[PDB]
């Protein structure tokens, strides 16, 4: 498969402006999971980086 989503099981760790923040039980579409920790994605229509360690993808 190909993981490319960010499902937050807990709050968001986005402390920066160039990042993106999600909430508990949320689905996010990742645009670039290439990285060893921080991946660049977007929630709904908001673009920003997120913690790939805090949340995990969702293969649907």
């Amino acid at each position: 498969g190909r993981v490319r989503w960010a499902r937050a099981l807990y709050d968001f760790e986005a402390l920066e402006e160039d990042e993106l923040g999600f909430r508990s039980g949320e689905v996010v579409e990742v645009l670039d999971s290439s990285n060893p920790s921080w991946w660049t994605g977007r929630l709904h229509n908001k673009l920003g980086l997120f913690p790939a360690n805090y949340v995990a993808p969702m293969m649907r």
Partner: peptide, 11 residues
Amino acid sequence: APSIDRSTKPA
């Protein structure tokens, strides 16, 4: 508790 470091952001 997942710990993320911003010192490794997409670079």
